[PDB]
Amino acid sequence: VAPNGSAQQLPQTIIIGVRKGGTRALLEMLSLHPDVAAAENEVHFFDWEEHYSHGLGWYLSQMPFSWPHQLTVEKTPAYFTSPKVPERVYSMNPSIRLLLILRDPSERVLSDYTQVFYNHMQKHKPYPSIEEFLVRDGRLNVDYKALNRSLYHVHMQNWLRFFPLRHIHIVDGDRLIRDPFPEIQKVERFLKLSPQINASNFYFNKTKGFYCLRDSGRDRCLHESKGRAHPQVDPKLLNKLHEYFHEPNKKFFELVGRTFDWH
C-alpha cells in the first residue's frame, strides 16, 4: 500500500486473446473507464514457464497500482491458444471473468501473417509469401499454424473445461472495428461497471482508417503495428480459406450459443 492509498491487485479480468482479434484496441478502450487499471504490456504469466515459476507474487508485481474498488486487467493474446493456461488461471481464481475478442477467422489469419511479415520487412529479413504458407501441393495447407489459431472451437473447448460459458464474454472484433462503442458497452455490462464510457470517447481517423480514442483533451490512435494492410490474395485462394472455416465456425457457434457474421 503506497502513501497515495494505491496497491497492486491481481487482475479481476483478463483479455486472453485471440492473437490479432483486436486485444490492444479492447485493452485501451476498456481502460478509458475510470474504475479500470490496465497493465500496459503483455504480461505472459501463465504461458511462459520462466514467468509462471516465479508465482503469484511475481504476477502481482507486474500489475498497475490501483485503488480497492478498481478492476485490474491484463492482456496476453497467447493465453487463449496455449493448452496449459486455463488450468493455471483456474487455480489463481475459478471465478474470474474473462474477455475473448474474435475476428472473422480468415481475416485473423491474414492479420497474423501481416504482422510477422512487417516485423521482418523492417529488420530487413526475408519472409515467405502468404501463398507459401497457405498452399501446399496445390491444396490449402492445413498445417499452417495461423489456421489452427483461427479454429476457435478447439481453443474455446479447452477454456470451457475450467470456466463456465457465462464467465467468458466474447467481443465481436469485426463489430469493434466498424463501431466500437456498442461492443464496449457490452463489456462494461458484463463486468458490472457503470456506463462511464461515451460515444464521444471515440472518433474515426481517416488517415488511420480506424477509430481513435479521445479522453479529457488528449487524442490517441493505436500504434503503427495496429491496422496494417493485408496482402492481396487470389480470390480462389481466399475462397478456399473462407470455406475451410465454415464447419469449425458452425461448431464454435453451437458451443457458445450465438453466431457471428463471418465469411
Q: Which residues bind ligand A3P (CB under 6 A)?
A: 20-25, 77, 111, 114, 176-177, 210-211, 222, 226-228
209 is in an annotated binding site: no
Residue nearer to ligand A3P on the CB measure, 77 or 105: 77
17 is in an annotated binding site: no
CB of 41 to ligand A3P, least distance (A): 13
- The CA distance from 163 to 151, in Å, is 19
Determine how many CB atoms are found less than 10 A away from the CB of residue 24: 18
Q: Are 213 and 202 in contact (CB under 8 A)?
A: yes
Residue nearer to ligand A3P on the CB measure, 56 or 116: 116
Residue nearer to ligand A3P on the CB measure, 22 or 86: 22
111 is in an annotated binding site: yes
CB of 54 to ligand A3P, least distance (A): 25
CB of 200 to ligand A3P, least distance (A): 15
Residue nearer to ligand A3P on the CB measure, 88 or 175: 175
57 is in an annotated binding site: no
Residue 216 burial (C-beta neighbours within 10 Å; 0-12, 13-18, 19+): exposed
Residue nearer to ligand A3P on the CB measure, 189 or 228: 228
228 is in an annotated binding site: yes
User: What are the residues whose beta carbons fall under 8 Å from the beta carbon of 89, sequence distance 6 or more?
Assistant: 14, 16, 46, 79, 96, 98, 162, 163
Of 169, 227, 221, 255, residue with least CA distance to 29: 221
- The CA distance from 73 to 98, in Å, is 10
CB of 15 to ligand A3P, least distance (A): 9
For 83-194, where are the E strands, in sequence order? Answer: 97-102, 135-136, 139-140, 168-172
76 is in an annotated binding site: no
Q: Are 23 and 15 in contact (CB under 8 A)?
A: yes
CB of 7 to ligand A3P, least distance (A): 28
Known binding residues for 3'-phosphoadenylyl sulfate: 20-24, 103, 111, 211, 226-230
Known binding residues: 20-24, 103, 111, 211, 226-230
